[PDB]
Amino acid sequence: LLQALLTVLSQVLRFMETEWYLPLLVLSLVLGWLNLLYYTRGFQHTGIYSVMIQKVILRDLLRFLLVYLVFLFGFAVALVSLSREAR
Amino acid sequence: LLQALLTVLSQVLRFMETEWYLPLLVLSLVLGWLNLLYYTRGFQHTGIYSVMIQKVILRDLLRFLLVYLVFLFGFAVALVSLSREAR
Numbered sequence A, B: 001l002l003q004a005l006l007t008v009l010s011q012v013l014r015f016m017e018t019e020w021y022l023p024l025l026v027l028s029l030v031l032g033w034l035n036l037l038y039y040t041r042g043f044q045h046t047g048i049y050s051v052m053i054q055k056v057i058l059r060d061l062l063r064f065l066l067v068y069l070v071f072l073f074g075f076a077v078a079l080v081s082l083s084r085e086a087r
């Protein structure tokens, strides 16, 4: 659905000649290629292999990102404030 | 306690206009953000996940650091003495 919405939006933006049509077109291209895993389930070779990604792999990747991004922000604000003074 | 002590010290230093108040203020900001894990225990979602850090994760990270830092010093002194002579 997202790939379809962005593609429709990108083509709508291209009609209005706004420069932001290209980023949406490129994001649609990235999402569309990633959507090709949906058709791996049609073959026993690729279907069984791609089972153990959504169950465990994809879930725990989100867990690290949320915790890490919070303290990435905490250190980023710390470094900028401390580095504002020159020698 | 450390975050409170450094924050009090940093504000005390700021009254005396010493430049070292900023590093203590920034260290307090880093520690204060890290103290936010204490409130993860209030939710079942985050409480159970954050259990397996203090028991095993944090302890063994200290083990590597103490052993590695000793021989980091040993190689550092070795490299400087050996690199003192130019070609």
Ligand SMILES: NCCOB(c1ccccc1)c1ccccc1
Pocket: A044, A045, A046, A049
């Ligand atoms: N040369 C075709 C190999 O096919 B795959 C495959 C073949 C037999 C059994 C299981 C998998 C495959 C390749 C990449 C990713 C996932 C599966």
Ligand SMILES: NCCOB(c1ccccc1)c1ccccc1
Pocket: A062, A063, A064, A066, A067, B044, B045, B046, B049
């Ligand atoms: N979108 C909320 C996800 O919540 B977390 C979560 C949800 C259900 C079960 C276990 C944990 C979570 C996220 C990051 C780190 C730790 C836990």
